[PDB]
Design a protein around this ligand. Structure first.
Ligand code: 5X0
Ligand code: 5X0
Lengths: 107, 106
């Protein structure tokens, strides 16, 4: 069922975006704010871009959606220090993310 | 190539000796983890990574990172956020990233 998947992913993504630790991940990181970011990170990802991909019917499987969302987190942990606010936010939001996937029974 | 090999060996060994590595040392058994292999399609562990290393599979940083990252993401996907295993995954992942940055791999 394609619109089953779509509705579930929309719901999940929207809850992730509304989470209080989502703020670092809402938009493409700007080169002005992140020194040499696009030299280090070859596959940049963010929640805006994920919203568009969703709207564009790109997420035809769980696996694709997970991959982009995990990329958000791995980009962040690759680039930032472990005790930085952004790294902490990545793990809080990841925990939340997994709890919402488990809730939905996405399999 | 033996530059890469030595660096990866060193990193992997340090990861395996870390006090939070214990959940990841061997393949998870279906007897101990209900429906694990239904949820997790690409299982990974540090024993298996040691073998792959010895087997000269890790010809690039990217391949090594991928398998090690998979160890953590498998664990977080399957376990509760406040479970001991989930906590260990993040402690060990932090340690891991600090060691790869130290070596100038990523
Ligand atoms: C997911 N967001 C980031 O990874 C990020 C990192 C940023 O880090 C700057 C920096 O100097 N980081 C750094 C510090 C020490 C060592 C290496 C990198 C700055 C803005 C960043 O993007 C956010 C995008 C919108 O929210 C505010 C900033
Ligand atoms: C990386 N290891 C695991 O993910 C794991 C999960 C296991 O599942 C236990 C379990 O019931 N987890 C669970 C708890 C609440 C809800 C769903 C699953 C069992 C053994 C597991 O690994 C073994 C424990 C450490 O010793 C060797 C491997």
């Amino acid at each position: 069922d394609p619109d089953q998947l779509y509705s579930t992913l929309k719901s999940i993504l929207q809850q992730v975006k509304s989470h209080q630790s989502a703020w670092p991940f809402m938009e493409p990181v700007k080169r002005t704010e992140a020194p040499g970011y696009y030299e280090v990170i070859r596959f940049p990802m963010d929640l805006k871009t994920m919203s568009e991909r969703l709207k564009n019917r790109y997420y035809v499987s769980k696996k694709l959606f997970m991959a982009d969302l995990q990329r958000v987190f791995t980009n962040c942990k690759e680039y930032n220090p472990p005790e930085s606010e952004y790294y902490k936010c990545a793990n809080i939001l990841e925990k939340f993310f997994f709890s919402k996937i488990k809730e939905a029974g996405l399999i």
